[PDB]
Amino acid sequence: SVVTKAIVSADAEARYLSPGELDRIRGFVSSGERRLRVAQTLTESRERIIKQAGDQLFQKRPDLVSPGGNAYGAERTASCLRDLDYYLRLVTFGIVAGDVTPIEEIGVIGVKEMYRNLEVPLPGMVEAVKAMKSVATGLLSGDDSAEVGYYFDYLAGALA
Amino acid sequence: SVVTKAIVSADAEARYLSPGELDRIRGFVSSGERRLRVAQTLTESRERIIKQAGDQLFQKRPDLVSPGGNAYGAERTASCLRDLDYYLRLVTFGIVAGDVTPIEEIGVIGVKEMYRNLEVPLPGMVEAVKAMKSVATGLLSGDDSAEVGYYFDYLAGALA
Amino acid sequence: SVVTKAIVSADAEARYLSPGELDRIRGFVSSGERRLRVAQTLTESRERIIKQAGDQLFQKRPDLVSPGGNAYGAERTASCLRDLDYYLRLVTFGIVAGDVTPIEEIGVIGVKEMYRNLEVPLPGMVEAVKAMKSVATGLLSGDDSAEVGYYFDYLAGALA
Amino acid sequence: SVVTKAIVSADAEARYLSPGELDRIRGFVSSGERRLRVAQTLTESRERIIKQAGDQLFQKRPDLVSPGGNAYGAERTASCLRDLDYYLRLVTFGIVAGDVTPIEEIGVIGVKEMYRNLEVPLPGMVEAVKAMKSVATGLLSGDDSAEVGYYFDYLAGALA
Amino acid sequence: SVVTKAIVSADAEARYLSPGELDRIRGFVSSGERRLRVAQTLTESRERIIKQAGDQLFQKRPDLVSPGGNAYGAERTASCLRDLDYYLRLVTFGIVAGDVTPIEEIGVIGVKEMYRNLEVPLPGMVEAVKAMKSVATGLLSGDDSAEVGYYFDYLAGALA
Amino acid sequence: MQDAITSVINTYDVQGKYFDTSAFDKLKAYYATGELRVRAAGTISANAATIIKEASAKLFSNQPDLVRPGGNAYTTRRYAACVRDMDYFLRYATYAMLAGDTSILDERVLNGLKETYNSLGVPISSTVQGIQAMKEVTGSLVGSGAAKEMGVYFDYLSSGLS
Amino acid sequence: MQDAITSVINTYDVQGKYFDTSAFDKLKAYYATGELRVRAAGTISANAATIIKEASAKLFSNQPDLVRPGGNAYTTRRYAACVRDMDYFLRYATYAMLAGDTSILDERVLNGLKETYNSLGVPISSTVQGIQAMKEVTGSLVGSGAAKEMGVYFDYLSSGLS
Amino acid sequence: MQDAITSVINTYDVQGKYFDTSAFDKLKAYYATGELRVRAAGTISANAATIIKEASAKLFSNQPDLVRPGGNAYTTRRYAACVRDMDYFLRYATYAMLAGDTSILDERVLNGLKETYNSLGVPISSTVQGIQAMKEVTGSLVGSGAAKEMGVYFDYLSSGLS
Amino acid sequence: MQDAITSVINTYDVQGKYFDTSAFDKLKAYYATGELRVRAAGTISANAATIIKEASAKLFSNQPDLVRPGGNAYTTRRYAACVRDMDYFLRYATYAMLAGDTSILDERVLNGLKETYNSLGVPISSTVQGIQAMKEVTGSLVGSGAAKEMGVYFDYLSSGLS
Amino acid sequence: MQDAITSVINTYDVQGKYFDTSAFDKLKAYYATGELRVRAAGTISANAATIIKEASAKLFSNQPDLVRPGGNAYTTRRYAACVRDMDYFLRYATYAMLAGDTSILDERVLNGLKETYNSLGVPISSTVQGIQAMKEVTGSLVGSGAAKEMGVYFDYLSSGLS
Amino acid sequence: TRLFKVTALIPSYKKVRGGRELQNTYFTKLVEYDRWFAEQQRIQKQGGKILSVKMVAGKPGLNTGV
Amino acid sequence: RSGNPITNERGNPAGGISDKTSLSPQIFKLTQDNR
Ligand SMILES: CCC1=C(C)/C(=C/C2=NC(=C\c3[nH]c(/C=C4\NC(=O)[C@H](C)[C@H]4CC)c(C)c3CCC(=O)O)/C(CCC(=O)O)=C2C)NC1=O
Ligand SMILES: CCC1=C(C)/C(=C/C2=NC(=C\c3[nH]c(/C=C4\NC(=O)[C@H](C)[C@H]4CC)c(C)c3CCC(=O)O)/C(CCC(=O)O)=C2C)NC1=O
Ligand SMILES: CCC1=C(C)/C(=C/C2=NC(=C\c3[nH]c(/C=C4\NC(=O)[C@H](C)[C@H]4CC)c(C)c3CCC(=O)O)/C(CCC(=O)O)=C2C)NC1=O
Ligand SMILES: CCC1=C(C)/C(=C/C2=NC(=C\c3[nH]c(/C=C4\NC(=O)[C@H](C)[C@H]4CC)c(C)c3CCC(=O)O)/C(CCC(=O)O)=C2C)NC1=O
Ligand SMILES: CCC1=C(C)/C(=C/C2=NC(=C\c3[nH]c(/C=C4\NC(=O)[C@H](C)[C@H]4CC)c(C)c3CCC(=O)O)/C(CCC(=O)O)=C2C)NC1=O
Ligand SMILES: CCC1=C(C)/C(=C/C2=NC(=C\c3[nH]c(/C=C4\NC(=O)[C@H](C)[C@H]4CC)c(C)c3CCC(=O)O)/C(CCC(=O)O)=C2C)NC1=O
Ligand SMILES: CCC1=C(C)/C(=C/C2=NC(=C\c3[nH]c(/C=C4\NC(=O)[C@H](C)[C@H]4CC)c(C)c3CCC(=O)O)/C(CCC(=O)O)=C2C)NC1=O
**Interchain contact, B160 vs F45, CB within 8 Å:** no
- State the burial class of residue G44 (Cβ atoms within 10 Å of its Cβ: 0-12, 13-18, 19+): buried
CB-based contact A39:F38 (threshold 8 Å): no
Return d(Cα G52, Cα F98) in angstroms, integer: 45
CB-based contact A1:A99 (threshold 8 Å): yes
Comparing CA positions, the residue from E12, E17, E8, E29 lying closest to residue E98 is E29
Return d(Cα D86, Cα D78) in angstroms, integer: 12
Residues with CB under 6 A from ligand 6: E 64, 70-71, 76, 79-80, 83-84, 86, 106-107, 118, 120-121, 124-125, 128; I 57, 60, 64, 67, 74-76, 79
Rg (CA), chain E: 18
Search chain J and give the residue with CA nearest H11.
J70
| Residue D76 CB coordination number (10 Å) | 15
**Interchain contact, F14 vs G70, CB within 8 Å:** yes
Chain C CB contacts of J54 under 8 Å are none
Tell me which residue has its CA closest to atom 37 in ligand 4. Answer: L5
Ramachandran quadrant class, F137 (left: phi over 0; alpha: psi -120 to 50; beta: rest): alpha
CB-based contact E25:G38 (threshold 8 Å): yes
Q: Which amino acid is at J18?
A: Y
CB-based contact H124:H21 (threshold 8 Å): no
Output K21-27 pairs: Cβ under 8 A, ≥24 positions apart: K21/L31, K22/H111, K22/H112, K22/H113, K22/H116, K23/L31, K23/L33, K23/L34, K24/L34, K25/H116, K26/H112, K26/H115, K26/H116, K26/H119, K27/L34
Return d(Cα K59, Cα L9) in angstroms, integer: 45
CB-based contact A4:F96 (threshold 8 Å): no
Return d(Cα F29, Cα C63) in angstroms, integer: 53
Q: What φ, ψ does residue E115 adopt, rounded to 5°?
A: -75, -20
Whole-Å CA distances, I142 to A8, D134, F15, I152: 60, 17, 77, 14
Return d(Cα H79, Cα J110) in angstroms, integer: 47
N-terminal to C-terminal alpha carbon distance within chain I? 23
CB-based contact E32:G31 (threshold 8 Å): yes
Question: What determination technique applies here?
Answer: cryo-EM
- State the burial class of residue C147 (Cβ atoms within 10 Å of its Cβ: 0-12, 13-18, 19+): buried
Chain A CB contacts of L4 under 8 Å are 109-110
Return d(Cα C30, Cα D31) in angstroms, integer: 14
Residues with CB under 6 A from ligand 2: B 64, 70-71, 76, 79-80, 83-84, 86, 106-107, 118, 120-121, 124-125, 128; J 60, 67, 74-76, 79
Q: In 3-state terms, what secondary structure has residue G70? A: coil
Q: Is the dihedral of CA L13, L16, L22, L24 positive or negative?
A: positive
Q: What φ, ψ does residue K51 adopt, rounded to 5°?
A: -90, -50
CB-based contact J118:K63 (threshold 8 Å): no
DSSP F130-147: HHHHHHHHHHHHH-HHHH
| Residue D3 CB coordination number (10 Å) | 30
Return d(Cα B62, Cα E91) in angstroms, integer: 91
Comparing CA positions, the residue from E22, E85, E16, E11 lying closest to residue E49 is E85
Return d(Cα E64, Cα D149) in angstroms, integer: 31
Q: Which amino acid is at K58?
A: G
Q: Is the dihedral of CA J98, J101, J104, J105 positive or negative?
A: positive
CB hemisphere CA count around J131 (13 angstroms): 26
Q: Which amino acid is at D153?
A: D
Rg (CA), chain C: 17
CB-based contact E108:E126 (threshold 8 Å): no
Q: Is the dihedral of CA A61, A66, A68, A73 positive or negative?
A: positive
N-terminal to C-terminal alpha carbon distance within chain K? 6
- Give me the helix-helix angle, F4-13 and A2-12, nearest 10°: 120
Nearest ligand, measured from the Cα of G129:
4
**J and B adjacent (3 or more CB pairs under 8 angstroms):** yes
Rg (CA), chain I: 18
Return d(Cα F14, Cα E118) in angstroms, integer: 67
The DSSP bridge pattern shows strands K26-32 and K49-55 to be unpaired
CB-based contact C154:J43 (threshold 8 Å): no
Return d(Cα C42, Cα C136) in angstroms, integer: 7
Return d(Cα C85, Cα B60) in angstroms, integer: 30
Sequence-separated (6 or more) residues with CB below 8 Å from residue J143 = J40, J43
- Strand ranges (DSSP E) for F10-141? none
Q: Which amino acid is at H13?
A: D
Q: What φ, ψ does residue K27 adopt, rounded to 5°?
A: -160, 145
Return d(Cα G31, Cα G24) in angstroms, integer: 10
Q: What φ, ψ does residue G126 adopt, rounded to 5°?
A: -70, -35
- State the burial class of residue F6 (Cβ atoms within 10 Å of its Cβ: 0-12, 13-18, 19+): buried
Residues with CB under 6 A from ligand 3: C 64, 70-71, 76, 79-80, 83-84, 86, 106-107, 118, 120-121, 124-125, 128; F 57, 60, 67, 74-76, 79
Chain C CB contacts of B116 under 8 Å are 122
Distance between Cα G83 and ligand 4 center (Å) = 9
CB hemisphere CA count around J151 (13 angstroms): 15
Touching chains, H (3+ CB pairs < 8 A):
B, J, K
Chain F CB contacts of B153 under 8 Å are 42-43, 46-47
Return d(Cα I132, Cα I124) in angstroms, integer: 12
State the Cα torsion G139-G142-G148-G149 to the nearest 10°. Answer: -130
> Among K56, K58, K65, whose Cβ lies nearest the Cβ of J10?
K65
Q: Is J26 in the pocket of ligand 7 (CB under 6 A)?
A: no
Search chain E and give the residue with CA nearest D58.
E68
Residue H106 CA from chain centroid, whole number: 11
Chain I CB contacts of G15 under 8 Å are 69-70
Resolution, angstroms, 1 dp: 2.6
CB-based contact J116:J123 (threshold 8 Å): no
N-terminal to C-terminal alpha carbon distance within chain C? 23
Return d(Cα G14, Cα I69) in angstroms, integer: 5
Q: Which DSSP category does C63 fall into?
A: G
Containing K27, the helix (H) or strand (E) segment is strand K26-32
Residue of A120, A133, A159 with the most ligand 1 atoms within 8 Å of its CB, for mutation: A120
Tell me which residue has its CA closest to atom 22 in ligand 1. Answer: A80
Q: Which DSSP category does B105 fall into?
A: I
Sequence-separated (6 or more) residues with CB below 8 Å from residue F54 = F133, F137
Ramachandran quadrant class, E60 (left: phi over 0; alpha: psi -120 to 50; beta: rest): alpha
Residue C30 C-alpha, separation from nearest chain B C-alpha, in angstroms? 41
Return d(Cα I90, Cα I96) in angstroms, integer: 10
- Give me the helix-helix angle, B142-159 and B32-44, nearest 10°: 70
Containing E45, the helix (H) or strand (E) segment is none
Q: Which DSSP category does J107 fall into?
A: I
CB-based contact I100:I160 (threshold 8 Å): no
CB-based contact E53:E135 (threshold 8 Å): yes
Q: Which DSSP category does A105 fall into?
A: I
Tell me which residue has its CA closest to atom 15 in ligand 4. Answer: G82
CB-based contact H37:B6 (threshold 8 Å): no
Return d(Cα K34, Cα B58) in angstroms, integer: 58
Residues making up chain B, counted from first to last: 160
**B and G adjacent (3 or more CB pairs under 8 angstroms):** no
- State the burial class of residue F93 (Cβ atoms within 10 Å of its Cβ: 0-12, 13-18, 19+): buried
Return d(Cα J23, Cα B95) in angstroms, integer: 70
Comparing CA positions, the residue from E87, E153, D65 lying closest to residue E79 is E87
- State the burial class of residue A37 (Cβ atoms within 10 Å of its Cβ: 0-12, 13-18, 19+): middle
Whole-Å CA distances, H115 to D33, D105, F154, H160, L34: 60, 41, 57, 12, 15
**Interchain contact, K27 vs L31, CB within 8 Å:** no
Return d(Cα A140, Cα L7) in angstroms, integer: 39
CB-based contact E124:E130 (threshold 8 Å): no
> Among B150, B154, B157, whose Cβ lies nearest the Cβ of F48?
B157
Write out the residues of chain C at the interface with chain J, using a CB-CB cutoff of 8 A.
126, 150, 153-154, 156-157, 160
Return d(Cα I73, Cα I65) in angstroms, integer: 9
Comparing CA positions, the residue from F116, F127, F90 lying closest to residue F105 is F90
Whole-Å CA distances, I6 to D23, D102, H19: 19, 33, 62
Touching chains, B (3+ CB pairs < 8 A):
A, C, F, H, J, K
Search chain F and give the residue with CA nearest G74.
F14
Tell me which residue has its CA closest to atom 31 in ligand 4. Answer: G78
Ramachandran quadrant class, C110 (left: phi over 0; alpha: psi -120 to 50; beta: rest): left
Return d(Cα I109, Cα A38) in angstroms, integer: 65
Q: In 3-state terms, what secondary structure has residue C106? A: helix
Residue J75 C-alpha, separation from nearest chain H C-alpha, in angstroms? 10
Return d(Cα A49, Cα A42) in angstroms, integer: 9
Q: Which DSSP category does K51 fall into?
A: E
DSSP chain I: ---HHHHHHHHHHHTT----HHHHHHHHHHHHHHHHHHHHHHHHHHTHHHHHHHHHHHHHHH-GGGTSTTSTT-SHHHHHHHHHHHHHHHHHHHHHHHHT-SHHHIIIIITTHHHHHHHHT--HHHHHHHHHHHHHHHHHHH-HHHHHHHHHHHHHHHHHH-
Residue F47 C-alpha, separation from nearest chain B C-alpha, in angstroms? 6
